[PDB]
Design an enzyme around this catalytic site. Structure first.
Site, PDB file in Angstrom:
ATOM      1  N   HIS A  68       0.894  -1.239   0.124  1.00  0.00           N
ATOM      2  CA  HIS A  68      -0.065   0.036   0.014  1.00  0.00           C
ATOM      3  C   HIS A  68       0.920   1.072  -0.105  1.00  0.00           C
ATOM      4  O   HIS A  68       0.518   2.061   0.680  1.00  0.00           O
ATOM      5  CB  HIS A  68      -1.081  -0.132   1.288  1.00  0.00           C
ATOM      6  N   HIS A  72       2.222   1.511  -5.801  1.00  0.00           N
ATOM      7  CA  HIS A  72       1.063   1.255  -5.880  1.00  0.00           C
ATOM      8  C   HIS A  72       0.260   2.329  -6.491  1.00  0.00           C
ATOM      9  O   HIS A  72      -0.405   2.048  -7.619  1.00  0.00           O
ATOM     10  CB  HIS A  72       0.237   0.819  -4.501  1.00  0.00           C
ATOM     11  N   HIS A 106      -5.373   7.648  -3.779  1.00  0.00           N
ATOM     12  CA  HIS A 106      -6.491   6.852  -3.538  1.00  0.00           C
ATOM     13  C   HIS A 106      -6.011   5.873  -2.242  1.00  0.00           C
ATOM     14  O   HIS A 106      -7.111   5.610  -2.050  1.00  0.00           O
ATOM     15  CB  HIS A 106      -6.896   5.896  -4.825  1.00  0.00           C
ATOM     16  N   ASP A 107      -4.956   5.661  -1.970  1.00  0.00           N
ATOM     17  CA  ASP A 107      -4.375   4.984  -0.617  1.00  0.00           C
ATOM     18  C   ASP A 107      -3.315   5.923   0.117  1.00  0.00           C
ATOM     19  O   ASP A 107      -2.593   5.497   0.522  1.00  0.00           O
ATOM     20  CB  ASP A 107      -3.776   3.799  -0.985  1.00  0.00           C
ATOM     21  N   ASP A 217      -7.477  -0.517  -8.988  1.00  0.00           N
ATOM     22  CA  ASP A 217      -6.685  -1.042  -7.656  1.00  0.00           C
ATOM     23  C   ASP A 217      -6.112  -2.391  -7.918  1.00  0.00           C
ATOM     24  O   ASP A 217      -5.172  -2.963  -7.498  1.00  0.00           O
ATOM     25  CB  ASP A 217      -7.752  -0.853  -6.664  1.00  0.00           C
ATOM     26  N   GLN A 269      -6.330 -17.551  -3.880  1.00  0.00           N
ATOM     27  CA  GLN A 269      -6.047 -16.608  -5.037  1.00  0.00           C
ATOM     28  C   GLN A 269      -7.155 -16.890  -5.990  1.00  0.00           C
ATOM     29  O   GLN A 269      -7.956 -16.195  -6.354  1.00  0.00           O
ATOM     30  CB  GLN A 269      -4.752 -16.799  -5.596  1.00  0.00           C
TER      31      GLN A 269
HETATM   32  C1  LIG Z   1      -9.804 -13.623  -0.794  1.00  0.00           C
HETATM   33  N1  LIG Z   1      -8.634 -14.480  -0.598  1.00  0.00           N
HETATM   34  C2  LIG Z   1      -8.577 -15.656   0.389  1.00  0.00           C
HETATM   35  C3  LIG Z   1      -7.033 -15.938   0.529  1.00  0.00           C
HETATM   36  C4  LIG Z   1      -6.614 -16.899   1.323  1.00  0.00           C
HETATM   37  C5  LIG Z   1      -7.397 -17.636   1.927  1.00  0.00           C
HETATM   38  C6  LIG Z   1      -6.604 -18.870   2.906  1.00  0.00           C
HETATM   39  C7  LIG Z   1      -5.215 -19.233   2.687  1.00  0.00           C
HETATM   40  C8  LIG Z   1      -4.463 -18.236   1.877  1.00  0.00           C
HETATM   41  C9  LIG Z   1      -5.054 -17.219   1.159  1.00  0.00           C
HETATM   42  N2  LIG Z   1      -6.353 -15.048  -0.270  1.00  0.00           N
HETATM   43  C10 LIG Z   1      -7.319 -14.327  -0.894  1.00  0.00           C
HETATM   44  C11 LIG Z   1      -7.045 -13.069  -2.062  1.00  0.00           C
HETATM   45  C12 LIG Z   1      -6.341 -11.932  -1.535  1.00  0.00           C
HETATM   46  C13 LIG Z   1      -6.358 -10.540  -2.309  1.00  0.00           C
HETATM   47  N3  LIG Z   1      -5.384 -10.940  -3.327  1.00  0.00           N
HETATM   48  C14 LIG Z   1      -5.475  -9.767  -4.102  1.00  0.00           C
HETATM   49  C15 LIG Z   1      -6.129  -8.501  -3.688  1.00  0.00           C
HETATM   50  C16 LIG Z   1      -5.285  -7.406  -4.639  1.00  0.00           C
HETATM   51  N4  LIG Z   1      -4.667  -8.351  -5.213  1.00  0.00           N
HETATM   52  N5  LIG Z   1      -4.809  -9.555  -5.247  1.00  0.00           N
HETATM   53  C17 LIG Z   1      -4.112 -10.583  -5.944  1.00  0.00           C
HETATM   54  C18 LIG Z   1      -6.890  -8.214  -2.561  1.00  0.00           C
HETATM   55  O1  LIG Z   1      -7.475  -7.191  -2.116  1.00  0.00           O
HETATM   56  N6  LIG Z   1      -6.844  -9.513  -2.114  1.00  0.00           N
HETATM   57 MG   LIG Z   2      -7.379   1.315  -0.466  1.00  0.00          MG
HETATM   58 ZN   LIG Z   3      -5.031   0.778  -3.671  1.00  0.00          ZN
END
Ligand SMILES: Cn1cc(-c2ccccc2)nc1/C=C/c1nc2c(cnn2C)c(=O)[nH]1
Ligand SMILES: [Mg+2]
Ligand SMILES: [Zn+2]
Length: 313
Positions: A68, A72, A106-107, A217, A269
């Site tokens: 962040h 970014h 934005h951040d 974003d 992911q």
């Molecule tokens: C929803 N989610 C669940 C998990 C997760 C759950 C269990 C173990 C490891 C990972 N990982 C994510 C993704 C996270 C995420 N990836 C992002 C974002 C921005 N870029 N990316 C790839 C964001 O805001 N969040």
């Molecule tokens: Mg933000």
């Molecule tokens: Zn951002």
């Protein structure tokens, strides 16, 4: 005002493509952002003396956190730039200005922790602003910066021009709150598929600009695999930190934020791309077809995660 910026031919050429990485050289980023301002808006949209002082007050107020951060801010600004250049008749001279300024601010002053964590830590900011906590904070710092003797890039605008652009930027920044994205897309979905979507409707434009802001974003997932893979690290580096602080508050954190549950990342992911990114770019492309390269890319990276799960990488 006859000063242009130019970029090394390779950057000059690659910067127009959605998947452009702004590189490891902090010193060039402000050139790159002014560069986008000029080609995207025009050479006299802003006084330089002032824009160069506003760009550097901004950089200064983004902290040293893994994701962040200043890179970014700028990565997001380029992606809105990419979007605007490929749709250059659908946006007004006020909306082309604001939105790039929105993307860079934005951040502002992000600490690395989620709105969830402020509120459970009982941070003061979560007292001053119940929902979209951080985002309302970030808009606050944008206007802070703006009223510094010397920094008002919108000086020259009329009262209503100026009052309008601060309202474009306000809704833009608040729409980066991924809470607020789920509802906003599903509306733009109904509206598009029942064909009641109208871009001369201000309430509709807003929803759409919101979708643009969320698309910009998350643009880490529209880069070439190795950029997206290395950005993911910086992302989980912040998630796990916030996880460590939840543990210290006596709270077991969602698996996403628990560093003891690394192994289960490829899976998480997947959920995200399926649950958030693919929907996000799918709609944005149905509304703004020249933004397909983002959806094509995003699907490529989904496929690459698929391959990480199957022990093939
Ligand atoms: C929803 N989610 C669940 C998990 C997760 C759950 C269990 C173990 C490891 C990972 N990982 C994510 C993704 C996270 C995420 N990836 C992002 C974002 C921005 N870029 N990316 C790839 C964001 O805001 N969040
Ligand atoms: Mg933000
Ligand atoms: Zn951002």
């Amino acid at each position: 005002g006859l000063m242009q910026f130019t970029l090394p031919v390779r950057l000059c050429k690659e910067i127009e493509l959605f998947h452009f990485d702004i590189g490891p050289f902090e010193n060039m980023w402000p050139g790159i952002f002014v560069y986008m301002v000029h080609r995207s808006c025009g050479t006299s949209c802003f006084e330089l003396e002032k824009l160069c002082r506003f760009i550097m007050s901004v950089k200064k107020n983004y902290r040293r956190v893994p994701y962040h951060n200043w890179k970014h801010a700028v990565t997001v600004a380029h992606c809105m730039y990419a979007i605007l250049q490929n749709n250059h008749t659908l946006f007004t001279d006020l909306e082309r200005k604001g939105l790039l300024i929105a993307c860079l601010c934005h951040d502002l002053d992000h600490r690395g922790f989620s709105n969830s964590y402020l509120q459970k830590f009982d941070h003061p900011l979560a007292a001053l602003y119940s929902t979209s906590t951080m985002e309302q904070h970030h808009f606050s710092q944008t206007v802070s910066i703006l009223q510094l003797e010397g920094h008002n890039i919108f000086s020259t605008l009329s009262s209503s021009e100026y009052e309008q652009v601060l309202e474009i930027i306000r809704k833009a920044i608040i729409a980066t709150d991924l809470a607020l994205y789920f509802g906003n897309r599903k509306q733009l979905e109904e509206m598009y598929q029942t064909g009641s979507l109208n871009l001369n409707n201000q309430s509709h434009r807003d929803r759409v600009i919101g979708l643009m802001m969320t698309a910009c974003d998350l643009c880490s997932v529209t880069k070439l695999w190795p950029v997206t893979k290395l950005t993911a690290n910086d992302i989980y580096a912040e998630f796990w930190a916030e996880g460590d602080e939840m543990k210290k508050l006596g709270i077991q954190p969602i698996p996403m934020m628990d560093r003891d549950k690394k192994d289960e990342v490829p899976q998480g992911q997947l959920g995200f791309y399926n649950a958030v990114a693919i929907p996000c770019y799918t709609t944005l492309t149905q509304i703004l077809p020249p933004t397909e390269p983002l959806l094509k890319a995003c699907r490529d990276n989904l496929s690459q995660w698929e391959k990480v799960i199957r022990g093939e990488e």
